[PDB]
Amino acid sequence: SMSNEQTFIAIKPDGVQRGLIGPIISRFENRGFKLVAMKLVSPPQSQLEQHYADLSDKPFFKGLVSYMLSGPICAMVWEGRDVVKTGRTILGATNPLASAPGTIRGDFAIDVGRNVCHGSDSVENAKKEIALWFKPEELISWKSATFDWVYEKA
Amino acid sequence: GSMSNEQTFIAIKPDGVQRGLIGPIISRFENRGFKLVAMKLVSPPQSQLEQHYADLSDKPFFKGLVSYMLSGPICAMVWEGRDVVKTGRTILGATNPLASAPGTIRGDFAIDVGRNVCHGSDSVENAKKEIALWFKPEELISWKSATFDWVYEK
Amino acid sequence: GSMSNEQTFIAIKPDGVQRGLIGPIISRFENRGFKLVAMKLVSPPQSQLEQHYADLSDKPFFKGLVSYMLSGPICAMVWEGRDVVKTGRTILGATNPLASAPGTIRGDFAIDVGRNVCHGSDSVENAKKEIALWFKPEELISWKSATFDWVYEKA
Amino acid sequence: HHGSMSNEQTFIAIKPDGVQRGLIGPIISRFENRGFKLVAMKLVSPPQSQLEQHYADLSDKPFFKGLVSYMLSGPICAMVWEGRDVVKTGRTILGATNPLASAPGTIRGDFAIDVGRNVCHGSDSVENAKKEIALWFKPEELISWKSATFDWVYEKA
Amino acid sequence: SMSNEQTFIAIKPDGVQRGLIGPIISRFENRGFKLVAMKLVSPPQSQLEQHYADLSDKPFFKGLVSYMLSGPICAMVWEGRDVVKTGRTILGATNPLASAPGTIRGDFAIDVGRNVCHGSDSVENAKKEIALWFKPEELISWKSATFDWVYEK
Amino acid sequence: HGSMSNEQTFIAIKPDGVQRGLIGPIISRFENRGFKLVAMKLVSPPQSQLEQHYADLSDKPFFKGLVSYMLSGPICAMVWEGRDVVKTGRTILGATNPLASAPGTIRGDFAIDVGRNVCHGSDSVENAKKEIALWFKPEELISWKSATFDWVYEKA
């Protein structure tokens, strides 16, 4: 609906390790979405446990957390119309085996446990994830010079 | 698509030109094996755009569609090849970029249907109409690709 | 129980070589995380092409296929990784380019099914057969990717 | 010395070998990405008399007839690009006229080998650009528009 | 000399506006340099005036600072052997008219006042710029899986 | 510059180039320029072959370490054919030490350390002939004619 919808996109440690920071940003940049926040971080274990709190009672929870601590993460907020859903489409199917070539995982990933990136799955979860990963002042307010060539209305 | 000399009309809309997408869009058709047989940068008169959109003259959005397409230059092209009409639309992606797949032009570069960066003829008959409308007959260039027999089974 | 050491046979056909597509096709598999184990430029003898296409020997226009595949060099490759046979086919795209999707090799580069730029094995068992047909065993290079553990969670 | 006027224009042509080898998109992208503005473009198979006029300075050379004949042998993507110093910087983007002397990263240093198959042409001076633009294009084929990012490409007008 | 030399690379507001974040990051990433800090920032005028302290007495100073306030900046620390000098080579000549195609400015820029990016000009100026633009905890310690294939050791 | 369009050179992608996923990009640089691939294989050659490859450097203190390093992974061995391909090939690779190389070349885009400089290219027409014959069996050189030869070359 509105062109100021926001989503959280993270490049996971394997994405950073395999040199995919540049290509992943370009996918979102070229599509017309606006980068409003970005930082390279090695977040503390508590933040990762809170991020994955829905999986806390799962037997893989401990190893998943320790894996996400194993290298830096490129955390980002992207803004645009339907950016949450279209963002997931750009990333491709969560399991790369189900993903389509032309998407990030369909071009770059194989294992679901090494699926290079994450994107919020809903507007509500995006708001939660943005608040968990960013301070409010880390979101930069700006307007793209080509806004009116990307969008027909607000 | 039966005959390898089928032709379609592809236009890069004002937003495609403004956002610097001329090169990338041409490369998509070039790399696929289609042959560019006509091209010009043009800002056509309102009467021509109204005739282009003649099948929509009885739609409420008709005037704003015409007025938007007057708001910047258009890269008008004729591409030739087997099934180029239908395959060309597949290359452009779904008319509404929200329904398009990454790896297509609109799936890589566009968000709003009113800013969907390009147009392609929707049928062989409409292609011939659009080609006759946008190009004089002598602007279609007759030539044979050096790799014709490697693109097409003889 | 798909193991990360599965192998498939990918070949760039004479039209792919002629049209300058060796680099981009290799990049598609390289970027995905699959490991190149074997590769060679080759113009194989007619008898090897006929054995490669054994399933088509009693179908029409068999001679025409073999002649066309003799008409230029082929870039023969072995790629290794988890589910590489099935995923490799998805990367190539639908065998008939008219049915393929942009973002695949054929959806980006090809038009005619008879000039569809590349080949990939259609099954694990046929890949093993094709790998043994096109490569001597010493031509398969055993190595370990520096990013193996960033591509794979398990073996 | 570089030009200082943002409305300078140059004539860029993709030659029949550049069209034949599938380099239209890549070549346009080099100028597009640099920030130059496309103000005219057409695919054209010009008459022999126009090519002879384009190469008028070489009319007495022994290779003239074969050069003209070669430039007739396939389509040409004719362009006018506009921007600050676009004549001289455009030639820098094309690379040395002889590709053997060109640098990788330029069009000829990425795509060409023989000077007689050097994929493209660019005007060699501001005055020759003005002449070439008028030779290859009708005046109404130059398109007036304003790039949305003009003020992020240029500090001054 | 040392493979842990660091330099400050900034994508200026024009580079952000023109959609060049991805390509610029890719140039450094593909070369083998390691990203150790990155943030998108709209830094305060005080920080920009410090960054340009040496030009404070120039006529263009006020407009220069105002321009660098006009859009976000992608601020980065890159690490690797000779990354300061080699980083400047990757960016191209500071004036894009003097830059070579194949560099960032030679591929994407025309005006020196709209030259898309900045890179430290010396190791000592890099240490100064990193301290000014980054907090120390924003620099992340990690080791590339391909370190031993980029570097002999 | 050479003037014979059938000149050949030996180009190798070193173990670090293979490890870092640069096979595709490096081949494309030569492919896009108009050079013709006439031989290619992935190989892990024996020490004796590498010592013969580097015979002109066998009096240098880095010789044994250079040989050992070239055994540390697979090598993509290639022969490319075209006018001035030896000298223009080296120009495409960039300066041997990437510190001195220019962006837009292979080493200027992808490499930092001279000991991890991604690739090798023959330094002379004669050394190309020797290297080609050292790395390939005679029958691994493939005879074919590029469909765009007459659009890459004006004559000869």
From Swiss-Prot, chain D:
It catalyses: a 2'-deoxyribonucleoside 5'-diphosphate + ATP = a 2'-deoxyribonucleoside 5'-triphosphate + ADP; a ribonucleoside 5'-diphosphate + ATP = a ribonucleoside 5'-triphosphate + ADP. Pfam families: NDK (PF00334). SMART domains: NDK. SUPFAM superfamilies: Nucleoside diphosphate kinase, NDK (SSF54919). Its cofactor is Mg(2+). The active site is at H121. The keyword Nucleotide-binding applies. Major role in the synthesis of nucleoside triphosphates other than ATP. The ATP gamma phosphate is transferred to the NDP beta phosphate via a ping-pong mechanism, using a phosphorylated active-site intermediate. This is Nucleoside diphosphate kinase.
Curated annotation (Swiss-Prot), chain F:
It catalyses: a 2'-deoxyribonucleoside 5'-diphosphate + ATP = a 2'-deoxyribonucleoside 5'-triphosphate + ADP; a ribonucleoside 5'-diphosphate + ATP = a ribonucleoside 5'-triphosphate + ADP. One of its GO terms (biological process) is CTP biosynthetic process. The keyword Disulfide bond does not apply. GO terms for molecular function: ATP binding; metal ion binding; nucleoside diphosphate kinase activity. The gene is ndk1. InterPro entries: NDK-like_dom (IPR034907), NDK-like_dom_sf (IPR036850), Nucleoside_diP_kinase (IPR001564), Nucleoside_diP_kinase_AS (IPR023005). HAMAP family: NDP_kinase (MF_00451). Its cofactor is Mg(2+). It is an enzyme of class 2 (transferase). Pfam families: NDK. Major role in the synthesis of nucleoside triphosphates other than ATP. The ATP gamma phosphate is transferred to the NDP beta phosphate via a ping-pong mechanism, using a phosphorylated active-site intermediate. This is Nucleoside diphosphate kinase. Gene3D superfamilies: Nucleoside diphosphate kinase-like domain (3.30.70.141). Belongs to the NDK family. CDD domains: NDPk_I. Homotrimer.
